[PDB]
């Protein structure tokens, strides 16, 4: 190519969007934004495919251009706006507040939240460094930059951010014994407590996580998001509480429900 690609073929869309194979030749290409294209959920999918408020692309645009949808307390009129992990989606007209979280199967789920819970969100810190004039600052994995951060905060920690004031109200250090959710890989959407951390010089760090039922799994450091201090998450989890159920037990539950 001679420059940036503006189209996304439907087969090339991320699988967790769950787009029909014969729905069309194209999928909504995520716009530039706080979240990466492969790790986002465009507002068009949320409003049309998931919530079914809009029956078409045109209806999605019509709904959004009325300034009726807010992301992180800010009105967004971009259909392909990348809304990702921990983001808050609010529709004041319908009195609906949603938080984007990964289900046990690794797909974004619109988790309904209370009004109080909709006033804050969690962020993961990438690094802390000095800006111009020697002013310290940190940036999160959702594109945010915060100046004069708490000196105790460091990379890979989780900060509680108040959307109304855009200030850090609390933070969690990345350490063993903290409940976390996996945001990538085959174990995406699972929730557990860190057991130990393996660090290799000049290589990715491995994190070992134990599920509430005792199941053990490991993942990379960049795929681990801390949800609270100790074993109690700071936000409400979706249905299933990040517990991955084997296909056999899922089938047993389905058959039991059938009768």
């Amino acid at each position: 190519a001679r420059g940036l690609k503006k189209h996304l073929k439907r087969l090339n869309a991320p699988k967790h969007w769950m787009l029909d194979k014969l729905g069309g030749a194209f999928a909504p290409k995520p716009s530039s934004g706080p979240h990466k294209s492969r790790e986002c959920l465009p507002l068009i999918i949320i409003l049309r495919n998931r919530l079914k408020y809009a029956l078409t692309y045109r209806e999605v645009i019509s709904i959004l251009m009325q300034r009726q949808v807010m992301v992180d307390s800010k009105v967004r009129t971009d259909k392909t706006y990348p809304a990702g992990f921990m983001d808050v989606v609010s529709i004041p007209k319908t009195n609906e507040n949603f938080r984007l979280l990964y289900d046990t199967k690794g797909r974004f789920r619109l988790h309904s939240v209370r009004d109080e819970e909709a006033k804050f969100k969690l962020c993961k810190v990438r690094s802390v460094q000095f800006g111009q004039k020697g002013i310290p600052y940190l940036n999160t994995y959702d594109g945010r930059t915060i100046r004069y951060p708490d000196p105790l905060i460091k990379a890979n920690d989780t900060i509680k951010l108040d959307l109304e004031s855009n200030k850090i109200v609390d933070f969690i250090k990345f350490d063993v014994g903290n409940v976390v959710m996996v945001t990538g890989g085959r174990n995406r959407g699972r929730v557990g407590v860190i057991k130990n951390r393996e660090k290799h010089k000049g290589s990715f760090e491995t994190v070992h996580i134990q599920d509430a039922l005792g199941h053990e799994f490991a993942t990379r450091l960049g795929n681990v998001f801390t949800l609270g201090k100790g074993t109690k998450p700071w936000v409400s989890l979706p249905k299933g509480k990040g517990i991955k159920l084997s296909i056999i037990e899922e089938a047993r539950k389905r058959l039991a429900a059938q009768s």
């Binding site: 073929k9 087969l11 194979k21 014969l22 069309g24 030749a25």
Partner: peptide, 8 residues
């Protein structure tokens, strides 16, 4: 691309 081609 013809979307019909993807039917198997």
């Amino acid at each position: 691309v013809h979307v019909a081609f993807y039917r198997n």
